């Protein structure tokens, strides 16, 4: 193990896939032994006659660096390099099965968390990436200079398709760019998916005609099977819907890659919801950090990705990882490796979770223009949200500091806007 899988002098090749593991060995197990174990359990597993019909060394994952975690005991970072040949091209499923498929059950590790993956450029080029990306999406929606605004329809369950479309129309005519299906809404008995799609399309057409701005609603196409998902995406395309939504973790990466390819072929934007992410990412000592899942989603394909409410610095790091073409390694921001995307288009972060119009200046400052602000509820409220957003953007461009002057900016905008005045009163 340590003699063959621990290579402290190995320098990773530009074609290698690198993984950063945070691990705690079980008492007794030395850290370097555990790191070589992580490298072995994620590449080869461990003699049989067929071994000498192969080149063992060539397909070996090498642990090339181990360092203790600052300010913690019995915690270490293991950096492992994997050859480019281990992985099927364009398959997030295969990369995940190779890296995190078995290593998390290894007994000699008390706790293991995959912190980061460096995807080599040669591997990145085998993926489609986002169907359109940030730039093309802004061009398709004709929206520039400001973050997009979204609202999730409430209540989650109970609304008929017609009343669902009513709520969508009210929010969209209010001044929001997007409304969205709840992730629980697929095709329940109270609201069959085709009725919902029909009525939402009608609401979108009406609000677009009234406002003169492109409107959208993330129609959830998450389905029990591949065929049902394709039928729902196809009907959304038939209605002229610009954007659809997919739950990539519960549906899976195979279905997500299929859908992203279809979205690229049919000119449809793909919003990605991250249901079940906390099952994997919440515990700081176990699982997969969400930044790895965000990178895998950028590879698999998605134009939007839900990225939490806003540790601030780590969220800034993975927003850079999903938006930028080149991200320097920065441990304060959780970026363990330098990531190059080779002109693969970026993914729009979606900040949600009751974002509280008084928090609009802070969100605009943190995320900038290339983001979606999702509000967790009628036309005046949508108008107040839109007015506050545009006032914050106008103030930021003028040079005023949103952190310090945000309340003042909102007060100034509220004097000539009654909806914003009421929202600030609340």
């Amino acid at each position: 193990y340590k003699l063959t899988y621990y290579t402290p002098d190995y320098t990773p090749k530009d074609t290698d896939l690198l993984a950063a593991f945070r691990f705690s060995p079980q008492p007794g197990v030395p850290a370097d032994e555990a790191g070589a174990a992580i490298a072995a359990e994620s590449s080869t597993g461990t003699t049989v006659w067929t071994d000498l019909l192969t080149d063992m060394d060539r397909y070996k994952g090498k642990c090339y660096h181990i360092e203790p975690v600052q300010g913690e005991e019995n915690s270490y970072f293991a950096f492992i390099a994997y050859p480019l040949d281990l992985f099927e091209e364009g398959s997030v499923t295969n990369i995940l099965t190779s890296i995190v498929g078995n290593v998390f059950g290894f007994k000699a590790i008390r706790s293991l968390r995959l912190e980061d993956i460096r995807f080599p450029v040669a591997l990145v080029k085998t993926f489609q990436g986002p169907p359109h990306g940030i730039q093309v999406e802004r061009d398709l929606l004709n929206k520039y200079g400001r973050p997009m605004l979204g609202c999730t329809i409430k209540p989650k369950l109970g609304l008929s398709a017609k009343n669902y479309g009513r709520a969508v129309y009210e929010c969209l005519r209010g001044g929001l760019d997007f409304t969205k299906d709840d992730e629980n809404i697929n095709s329940q008995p109270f609201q069959r998916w085709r009725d919902r799609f029909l009525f939402v399309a009608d609401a979108i057409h009406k609000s677009q005609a009234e406002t003169g701005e492109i409107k959208g609603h993330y129609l959830n196409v998450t389905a029990p099977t591949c065929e049902e998902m394709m039928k729902r995406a196809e009907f959304a395309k038939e209605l002229g819907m610009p954007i659809i939504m997919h739950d990539f973790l519960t549906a899976g990466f195979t279905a997500n890659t299929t859908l992203a390819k279809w979205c690229r072929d049919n000119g449809v934007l793909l919003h990605i919801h991250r249901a079940m992410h906390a099952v994997i990412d919440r515990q700081r000592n176990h699982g997969i950090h969400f930044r790895v899942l965000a990178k895998c989603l950028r590879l698999s394909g998605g134009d939007h990705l839900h990225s939490g409410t806003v540790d601030k610095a780590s969220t800034l790091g993975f927003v850079d990882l999903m938006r930028e073409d080149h991200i320097e390694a920065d441990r304060s921001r959780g970026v363990f490796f330098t990531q190059d995307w080779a002109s693969m288009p970026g993914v729009l972060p979606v900040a949600s979770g009751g974002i509280h119009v008084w928090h609009m200046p802070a969100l605009v400052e943190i995320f900038g223009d290339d983001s979606v602000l999702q509000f967790g509820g009628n036309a005046p409220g949508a108008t107040a949200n839109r007015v506050a957003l545009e006032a914050c953007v106008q103030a930021r461009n003028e040079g005023r500091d949103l952190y310090r002057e945000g309340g003042d900016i909102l007060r100034e905008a509220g004097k000539w806007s009654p909806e914003l005045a009421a929202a600030l009163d609340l």
Partner: protein, 101 residues
């Protein structure tokens, strides 16, 4: 009646001081203003007619204002939009109306 335009159209019509501040921000970021005009404003209509060139060699916000004033005097019954492009990031970062008929 209640028609909107994508950015800043939920704010009051921008004054020449506010337009100058926006153009000044554009100049600091290096976004060279592009003035375009149209007789209508339809969400599905991407392209507008450009006002005679993008101002690459612009040193003052006032010259962009003069170009907007001249297009106003030529197309008083047309909308006027100011666009800016981040050519390094290859993204249009600015698009806002400065004149309505």
């Amino acid at each position: 009646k209640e028609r909107r335009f994508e950015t800043f159209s939920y704010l009051p019509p921008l004054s020449d001081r506010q337009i100058a501040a926006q153009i000044e921000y554009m100049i600091e970021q290096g976004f060279h203003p592009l003035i375009e005009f149209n007789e209508h404003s339809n969400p599905e209509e991407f392209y507008w007619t450009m006002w005679k060139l993008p101002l690459f060699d612009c040193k003052s916000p006032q010259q962009v204002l003069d170009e907007v004033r001249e297009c106003r005097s030529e197309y008083g019954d047309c909308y006027i939009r100011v666009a800016g492009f981040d050519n390094i990031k290859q993204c249009q970062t600015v698009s806002f109306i400065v004149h309505r008929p």
